[PDB]
Amino acid sequence: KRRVVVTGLGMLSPVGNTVESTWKALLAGQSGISLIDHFDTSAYATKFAGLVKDFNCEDIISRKEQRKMDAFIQYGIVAGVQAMQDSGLEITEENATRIGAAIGSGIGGLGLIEENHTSLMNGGPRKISPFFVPSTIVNMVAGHLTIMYGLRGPSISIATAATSGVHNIGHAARIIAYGDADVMVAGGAEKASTPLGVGGFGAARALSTRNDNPQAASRPWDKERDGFVLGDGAGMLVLEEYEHAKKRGAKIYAELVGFGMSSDAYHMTSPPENGAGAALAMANALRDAGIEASQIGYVNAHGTSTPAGDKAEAQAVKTIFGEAASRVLVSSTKSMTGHLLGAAGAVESIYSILALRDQAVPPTINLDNPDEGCDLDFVPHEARQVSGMEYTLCNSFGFGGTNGSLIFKKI
Amino acid sequence: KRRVVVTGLGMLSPVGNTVESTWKALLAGQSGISLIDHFDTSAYATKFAGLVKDFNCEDIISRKEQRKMDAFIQYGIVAGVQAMQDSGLEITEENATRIGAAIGSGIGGLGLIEENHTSLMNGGPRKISPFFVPSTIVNMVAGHLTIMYGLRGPSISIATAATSGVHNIGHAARIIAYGDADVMVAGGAEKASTPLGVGGFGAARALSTRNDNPQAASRPWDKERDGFVLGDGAGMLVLEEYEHAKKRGAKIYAELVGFGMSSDAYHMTSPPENGAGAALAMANALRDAGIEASQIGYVNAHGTSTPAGDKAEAQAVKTIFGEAASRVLVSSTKSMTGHLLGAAGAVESIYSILALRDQAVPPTINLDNPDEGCDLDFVPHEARQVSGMEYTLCNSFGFGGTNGSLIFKKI
Numbered sequence: 022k023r024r025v026v027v028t029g030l031g032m033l034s035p036v037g038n039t040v041e042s043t044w045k046a047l048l049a050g051q052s053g054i055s056l057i058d059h060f061d062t063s064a065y066a067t068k069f070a071g072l073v074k075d076f077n078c079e080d081i082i083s084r085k086e087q088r089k090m091d092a093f094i095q096y097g098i099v100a101g102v103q104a105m106q107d108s109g110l111e112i113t114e115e116n117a118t119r120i121g122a123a124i125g126s127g128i129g130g131l132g133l134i135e136e137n138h139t140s141l142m143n144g145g146p147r148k149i150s151p152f153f154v155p156s157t158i159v160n161m162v163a164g165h166l167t168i169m170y171g172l173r174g175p176s177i178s179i180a181t182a183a184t185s186g187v188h189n190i191g192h193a194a195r196i197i198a199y200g201d202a203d204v205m206v207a208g209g210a211e212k213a214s215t216p217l218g219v220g221g222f223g224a225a226r227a228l229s230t231r232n233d234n235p236q237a238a239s240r241p242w243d244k245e246r247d248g249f250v251l252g253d254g255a256g257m258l259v260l261e262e263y264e265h266a267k268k269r270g271a272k273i274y275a276e277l278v279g280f281g282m283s284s285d286a287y288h289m290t291s292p293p294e295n296g297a298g299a300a301l302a303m304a305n306a307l308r309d310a311g312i313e314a315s316q317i318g319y320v321n322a323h324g325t326s327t328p329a330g331d332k333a334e335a336q337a338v339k340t341i342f343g344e345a346a347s348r349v350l351v352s353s354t355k356s357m358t359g360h361l362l363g364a365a366g367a368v369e370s371i372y373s374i375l376a377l378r379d380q381a382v383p384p385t386i387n388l389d390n391p392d393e394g395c396d397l398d399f400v401p402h403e404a405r406q407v408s409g410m411e412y413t414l415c416n417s418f419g420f421g422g423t424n425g426s427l428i429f430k431k432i
Numbered sequence: 433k434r435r436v437v438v439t440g441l442g443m444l445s446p447v448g449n450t451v452e453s454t455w456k457a458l459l460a461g462q463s464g465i466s467l468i469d470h471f472d473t474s475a476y477a478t479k480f481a482g483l484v485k486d487f488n489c490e491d492i493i494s495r496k497e498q499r500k501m502d503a504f505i506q507y508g509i510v511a512g513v514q515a516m517q518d519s520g521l522e523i524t525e526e527n528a529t530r531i532g533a534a535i536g537s538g539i540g541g542l543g544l545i546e547e548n549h550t551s552l553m554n555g556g557p558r559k560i561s562p563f564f565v566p567s568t569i570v571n572m573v574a575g576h577l578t579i580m581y582g583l584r585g586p587s588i589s590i591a592t593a594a595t596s597g598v599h600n601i602g603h604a605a606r607i608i609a610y611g612d613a614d615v616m617v618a619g620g621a622e623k624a625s626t627p628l629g630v631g632g633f634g635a636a637r638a639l640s641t642r643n644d645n646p647q648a649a650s651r652p653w654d655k656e657r658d659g660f661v662l663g664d665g666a667g668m669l670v671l672e673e674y675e676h677a678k679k680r681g682a683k684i685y686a687e688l689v690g691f692g693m694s695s696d697a698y699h700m701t702s703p704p705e706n707g708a709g710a711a712l713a714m715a716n717a718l719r720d721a722g723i724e725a726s727q728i729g730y731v732n733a734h735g736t737s738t739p740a741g742d743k744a745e746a747q748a749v750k751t752i753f754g755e756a757a758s759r760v761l762v763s764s765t766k767s768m769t770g771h772l773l774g775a776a777g778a779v780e781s782i783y784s785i786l787a788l789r790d791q792a793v794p795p796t797i798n799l800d801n802p803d804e805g806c807d808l809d810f811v812p813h814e815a816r817q818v819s820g821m822e823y824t825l826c827n828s829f830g831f832g833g834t835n836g837s838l839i840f841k842k843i
């Protein structure tokens with residue numbers, strides 16, 4: 022039976038352009054939310070987001086290649102290179118066939134979709150860029166990274182809205198465990214802070230409109246919450262079969278032990294009050310890992326800061342953890358980072374892993390006045406020191422009622 | 433060890449709005465390509481495509497729900513309902529948790545992306561539809577079908593350009609075999625025949641521009657070929673664990689025995705001359721199925737009608753089949769249907785299955801003057817009667833160099 026471990030990490034987020042800088046900022050409760058300045062937000066109900074500050078790909082992507090990629094792909098590539106470098110893995114003719122990728126995005130290249138469509142409206146199809154398709158489609162991060170590293174193994178890209186990051190990581194692990202690969206770079210990337218992204222999610226009445234205090238906007242489980250805050254970035258993990266990792270002397274961050282999936286079968290853009298779908302996904306991951314709920318020390322929640330979404334997950338956690346419900350720590354790092362959509366489950370899996378390494382759990386900031394009758398410990402305001410934590414669980418749910426949960430185990 | 437079989441089929445294509453009507457047309461060598469009339473093609477270099485004729489969802493999708501979905505989702509839903517009905521499966525509180533979906537698309541809702549962006553350009557973000565996001569994103573076919581049927585099991589959506597259909601079907605099978613589900617509705621849907629789709633792929637110099645003879649445009653392996661022909665539609669299969677199918681008396685079309693994946697690691701929009709990536713995917717599927725190349729009776733090719741793409745796959749088939757290379761039949765149904773992109777591998781898996789049932793293989797029409805020095809039997813012009821065919825193989829390759837192959841076995 023093939024075990025899967027994590028041997029490399031890469032990340033760009035609204036609170037940092039590296040894995041360690043991001044983690045340090047989160048443990049310090051720092052918000053990465055600010056006013057948007059790259060497009061005129063005068064007519065927009067929401068005028069802020071979690072932006073990647075000073076993104077730099079100068080020594081990573083050539084000038085000729087950059088022009089063929091939407092920002093989401095550039096972010097995904099940079100984070101993937103960080104992960105591959107961190108892993109110390111060396112690609113050879115002999116193992117190239119055994120290394121692949123599972124990397125997705127929820128919405129893909131909105132920026133270049135807008136640019137190409139604007140061009141078409143203004144001057145006809147002759148003005149569409151030859152790069153339109155490959156610069157926008159969701160699977161292009163995987164495409165570029167395999168070419169860059171000479172990876173010939175399986176490559177897939179799961180696009181399940183906010184569940185993407187978790188599904189790609191989960192299936193990369195399945196692929197390795199099944200025997201189709203020994204290593205996979207997996208994760209997600211997103212850059213939806215554009216007119217269509219902000220305007221689109223705004224049209225759905227899904228975003229916080231707290232323009233007067235952007236850093237206090239994302240407040241999961243707080244009574245004054247009014248929708249999610251969009252965040253940009255990318256998270257990538259190098260997953261690897263255990264004996265393969267040991268043989269080459271890899272550094273091992275944690276083990277990936279459980280992966281659960283479910284569907285709400287309720288409504289396209291809202292969960293059932295019950296949180297039955299969320300619960301089933303967590304139950305499935307626990308069964309996959311062969312452990313009980315009481316063994317989980319921390320749950321990095323989906324917790325987007327929407328009125329109904331946050332309540333359903335709290336109900337789901339209560340259902341699954343029962344008597345232990347008050348003893349597990351639960352936090353939503355989206356309180357600081359915003360919602361990275363297709364990259365959310367990827368960066369949040371990284372947070373779940375580092376929590377095991379450092380035995381420290383990041384807080385749900387802004388939780389000033391929690392919804393009434395719920396006795397869960399949402400790690401409000403300040404990071405928490407933990408002691409003999411062996412397992413963490415990461416939840417990611419998505420439009421369409423698609424759910425996913427991953428469980429990581431220390432060492 | 434859990435075996436996976438096919439118990440239901442659903443399909444909309446340019447040659448028919450049902451599984452049997454489509455198959456009858458293909459065995460008869462009928463083209464489904466015609467001039468586009470739903471948008472003004474005056475300024476477009478390519479003015480034809482494979483369109484779904486007289487699509488009807490009146491008794492399937494309510495008027496209230498139709499307005500929330502791009503055409504690709506409406507096609508995917510109709511084909512999924514056809515498959516679920518064909519399967520005879522009855523969803524209960526007891527099995528709901530064991531039934532899921534793996535359905536994707538390569539490009540998603542171009543039609544409604546254009547409509548929403550046009551609205552934004554003309555009147556600001558206030559004019560974007562509240563349905564923008566859920567009406568366009570790739571995972572919405574899976575989302576709607578799970579809600580419609582009350583499916584609570586795993587739902588994923590793989591978006592790997594033209595490889596989508598094969599990857600979704602392959603991973604649905606993996607999910608069942610692993611134990612995460614007993615049944616999965618899997619496949620793909622696409623409706624990229626819009627200004628951005630035709631103009632976008634046209635900008636890349638990837639489409640045939642034979643406007644004076646649209647039905648002769650798609651001509652895989654023919655010397656006068658000049659790019660692919662875009663096709664719309666959707667293909668869905670109900671996959672099911674073997675003992676589960678038998679117990680309820682399901683009708684069984686074929687068994688899914690092998691699934692292989694690879695990456696070219698060559699170029700974003702073209703394969704290597706070698707076809708090494710295509711070859712590895714077929715090799716992987718053969719190994720997964722535990723059989724030799726000589727046992728395959730028919731290969732339904734990726735064969736899009738591009739100069740370099742068709743040559744690389746012919747080289748790959750020669751590499752894998754060697755001495756048997758001239759004895760296996762190879763055909764590209766895209767010669768009649770056009771390229772359904774994210775749905776191509778789904779409808780083509782259906783063709784691969786029916787070929788086993790009927791012991792008949794559809795032709796590569798338009799193959800008037802085959803490229804020189806290649807001795808493969810591409811089933812030119814006319815369908816072929818076969819005799820003791822036990823295995824078929826379906827190839828699907830995609831931008832980003834991502835490849836996939838599936839192998840189906842009779843009974």
Ligand SMILES: C=C1C[C@@]23C=CC(=O)[C@@](C)(CCC(=O)Nc4c(O)ccc(C(=O)O)c4O)[C@@H]2C[C@@H]1C[C@H]3O
Nearest residue numbers: 183226227290291292325327328329330418419420
């Ligand atoms: C149907 C409704 C009712 C409505 C009312 C209260 C709410 O909380 C929101 C604002 C968001 C629900 C949600 O959490 N969806 C939801 C979900 O199910 C799965 C994933 C996500 C995600 O962000 O990743 C998500 O956001 C909904 C959205 C739309 C309009 C609002 O009035």
Ligand SMILES: C=C1C[C@@]23C=CC(=O)[C@@](C)(CCC(=O)Nc4c(O)ccc(C(=O)O)c4O)[C@@H]2C[C@@H]1C[C@H]3O
Nearest residue numbers: 594637638701702703736738739740741829830831
């Ligand atoms: C890089 C080039 C060179 C060029 C020259 C000859 C060709 O054949 C085409 C027209 C298409 C190659 C191809 O088959 N890609 C290709 C591929 O790798 C994987 C999938 C598909 C698919 O359609 O699903 C596909 O189409 C390419 C496209 C672009 C411009 C042309 O001059």
